Write a protein that binds this ligand. Structure first.
Ligand code: ORN
Ligand code: ORN
Ligand code: ORN
Ligand code: MN
Ligand code: MN
Ligand code: MN
Ligand code: MN
Ligand code: MN
Ligand code: MN
Lengths: 298, 298, 298
């Protein structure tokens, strides 16, 4: 299936500037060339125009920083993504902080009876204005897409929820706020924290993950946050957490998903060139994209 | 069985100068002392005299750079190695780029009904003048040993092929040229790329490898290319490839081979002091040799 | 009946290179011109694409050299010949070593209830992998067509055998392997060695041959190997044998066949320009073809 790249230069979902440079950092890391080599009909639809956020002061919720700019950008993203899917193409969204997942899922989900989600991340991203300790919207996209949160975020695309909790699998988690641990526990979301990764091994985690979703979804969206990898492998992220997944574990995961042929959409987020070591993180993202799309060693 | 060390100061198999210093770097990294401690009768036969290759433009060799010099040095190596085996000693060859495998296997194979080969490397080294993208002979030793390539290389020692495809096991591969992928596929060579190492685990890979060769060979030659380890573990190599085997995985491999008692000859190649970090790579090689030769933690 | 020429530039059936130049040597010798003069609707379908054999050391059995390439080439030939017959034309096949008879007979035989065969040769070509003293497939086409040999050769065309031993007549034989003498003896194949040609005379041998086949077949294929003539008359052959048939004996034979009107298909093989004296052998072939197709002195 032909691919369509959409860049979302977003940084309003959090506070470290530079994550808005992720789309071009990955383009510069050679994402087009990489995918063209795999004989893909790759197309670059450019970037979603993001508006500058109103200053905190006259702005409404500190528990929902930059809500309007974030909500509007995601509206545009949802539309762009919706059209790509309608055109029969695979939407590959490049971020940008994780709050863009709200728009990506808003444009994809409407097209599936039961869309599953693989949330590759160090965080759960299931906070609300009530549970969020930062007010950073990049820490709320999964909950908002599950129908939990401010209507400005939950109603993107004119419908909700975008997905069901039983159709979500979290991988590489190692930093959850108390409210989030409770949310995960109660909504019954499937999750493999680093303990399970260390205990079971990435192979078993991926096998179980793929089998689980394949048995109850009709499309799977890969929401890959680069901070899911160890800061040593992916240094250029705004909210890094030590003791993460390795470069190899990430490739195996992508390779196993490629093989499974279950990934119907994807987004690579949180790449921040301004916090990286010579574009290393964008590079990792591009390599991981290659594996996801079927690149093989043999 | 007594060991005989033969240094092969070869760099004509590729383009990065310095890999000819590999033999002395490893000697300086303490190869003799290491092996003597395991109570071996270790002997150092010095180095094979390598002649400088004539100008590429003057002698015909571009898809086969330095063919004359590489072919003759390997002739000498073949003889030296043949004699060591005849004397009832184990030939431990220190390189030198990987093209020296052509001479080592040329002197060992004639002594075995079915010699097996474990090719520990990031590459397959199964290119021919036709498939080679570089013209570097260090990327052709395995194919040449299997009887595929220029006669100047396939006929070293007055016979061919030195080994059969079904008796070869590649491990750690993560960079194969298209022609090579096809070669491996068609010749039916057993291979464990990094995907299999990540998926199955080094223990499994080594168990399967040892059992496979043990069931159908009468001797096994270990051709260990230091670039099979990750560049962070083995930085001093001319053609590094990221996402490689770890220091520990390599020690386990060597430890399990020692245990199986199947390795009848070996060569440690691609050590280049001029691209290393304080002889780190020669050091890893020496350590790995200690394990191979039975060194144990307990 | 219109004629259709099909060149089969094959030399994989034996070891002397050059016999693949036979088709063009005969064309240059003027085969088209010769036949057009007899007012035939002659058509050249070009040549069958022949692949390059795989390395001898990687081949399955040394008693069946180049089996794959020889088997595949014969598959294409059988198809080409089959179609010619279907179009109501006479297939005239130009070789190429004698292994091509396997393809020719595979395309013709299916169209007859009882196809007879006249094998004009110094050899019997009835060897198998077991009885072959050379491993050369050009020494096995008759046996394989009789259904005896490797399935790769006996099953060309999807059926077997192509002919019955009682419908075969050998002429000019003077070099048979022991296994072959036994085969001919036991399968009860009719044969006129040079002893019979010297004792009875070519006229009697032909009279007897034509009457024998005419009484029990519905079509006769002429498999004329140029080495059936004496090396003085036909020097350009890879496996010459002295004391063969003369130029005149061969013309008489062709003249008596034309008269008999029994030949429904034919092939002229083993012409090798690289072992000839100024295209002398291709020239004899062409002349012989002229007589076969009715050319007369008066
Ligand atoms: N996307 C990262 C979210 C970080 C943190 N758990 C928060 O809610 O602020
Ligand atoms: N020994 C390294 C070889 C690398 C590459 N396949 C080449 O043939 O150039
Ligand atoms: N077509 C020539 C055959 C020669 C010999 N009888 C052989 O089997 O090699
Ligand atoms: Mn996230
Ligand atoms: Mn994260
Ligand atoms: Mn190598
Ligand atoms: Mn290598
Ligand atoms: Mn013959
Ligand atoms: Mn003959």
């Amino acid at each position: 299936k032909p691919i369509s790249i959409i860049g979302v230069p977003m940084d309003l979902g959090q506070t470290r500037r530079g994550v808005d440079m992720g789309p071009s950092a990955m383009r510069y890391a050679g994402v087009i060339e990489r995918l063209e080599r795999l004989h893909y009909d790759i197309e670059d639809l450019g970037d979603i125009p993001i508006g500058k956020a109103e200053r905190l002061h006259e702005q409404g919720d500190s528990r929902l920083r930059n809500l309007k700019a974030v909500a509007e950008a995601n509206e545009k993203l949802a539309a762009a993504v919706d059209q790509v899917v309608q055109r029969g193409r695979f939407p590959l969204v490049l971020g940008g902080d994780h709050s863009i997942a709200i728009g990506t899922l808003a444009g994809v989900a409407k097209h599936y009876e039961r869309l599953g989600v693989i949330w590759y991340d160090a965080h759960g991203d299931v906070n609300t204005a009530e549970t969020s300790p930062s007010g950073n919207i990049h820490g709320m996209p999964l909950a908002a897409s599950l129908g939990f949160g401010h209507p400005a975020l939950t109603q993107i695309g004119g419908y909700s929820p975008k997905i069901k909790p039983e159709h979500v699998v979290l991988i590489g988690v190692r930093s959850l706020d108390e409210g989030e641990k409770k949310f995960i526990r109660e909504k019954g979301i499937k999750i493999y924290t680093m303990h399970e990764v260390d205990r079971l091994g990435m192979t078993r985690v991926m096998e179980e993950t793929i089998a689980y979703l394949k048995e109850r979804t009709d499309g799977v969206h890969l929401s890959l946050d680069l901070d899911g990898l160890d800061p040593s492998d992916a240094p250029g992220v705004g909210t890094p957490v030590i003791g993460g997944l390795t470069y190899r574990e990430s490739h195996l995961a992508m390779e196993m998903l490629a093989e499974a042929q279950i990934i119907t959409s994807a987004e690579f987020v949180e790449v921040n060139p301004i916090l990286d070591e010579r574009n290393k993180t964008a590079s990792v993202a591009v390599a991981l994209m290659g594996s996801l799309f079927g690149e093989k060693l043999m």
